Structure formats: structure tokens, C-alpha cells
Write a protein that binds this DNA or RNA. Structure first.
Length: 93
RNA sequence: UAAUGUCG
């Protein structure tokens, strides 16, 4: 039919600690399905983390299960938030 | 929960 939203197999993440790395999100997101890419962009002004990230699955049903089994979770002693990404020109086609 | 998806 079509994509679940303005994006496909992508998940926004927030509430992360400044110590969280792409290996932490990979270890947290892998049991729900095959991960295909991960992003943790720094502030682009001071080279520091902002407590948010993105994760991307090989399948869309794995991203839906990840929303259903990782939202409101807790990483590094802080509560996280997880959902599909907001509308914007994505790096993908 | 919000992005300049550290340019691949």
C-alpha cells in the first residue's frame, strides 16, 4: 500500500544520556529486527551530543515492533522517547 | 518526545 508515515523504517529517539553511542542504540534496538543504519548527530556548533538520535531498520514491521517494545524505556538512567521521524527532506530517496 | 540524520 505505502509507507507508515512521511518516512520508512526510521525511528526518532530522545531523552538519551550524553554517554549514549551508536553501539548502545544498536544493542538496544537489535532484538526487534535487523537494523540497517543508526545516527547520533552532535550539535554541529560545539561537537557535543543533544540527547537524541535516529535508528533505521531493514524492515518496516521491525520498526513498528521497536516502537511497540522500546518506547518509554530507560537508557543510561534516563527515560527515552521513540516514534517515527517528523516530515523533512530525508537523506534517502 | 525533535534534526545541521557528523557528509556515508
Amino acid at each position: 500500500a505505502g509507507h507508515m508515515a512521511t518516512t520508512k523504517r526510521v525511528l526518532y529517539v530522545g531523552g538519551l544520556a550524553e554517554e549514549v553511542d551508536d553501539k548502545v542504540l544498536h544493542a538496544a534496538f537489535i532484538p526487534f529486527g535487523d537494523i540497517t543504519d543508526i545516527q547520533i548527530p552532535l550539535d554541529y556548533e560545539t561537537e557535543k551530543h543533544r540527547g537524541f538520535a535516529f535508528v533505521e531498520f531493514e524492515l518496516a514491521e521491525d520498526a513498528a515492533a521497536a516502537i511497540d517494545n522500546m518506547n518509554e524505556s530507560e537508557l543510561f538512567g534516563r527515560t527515552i522517547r521513540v516514534n517515527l521521524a517528523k516530515p523533512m527532506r530525508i537523506k534517502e530517496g
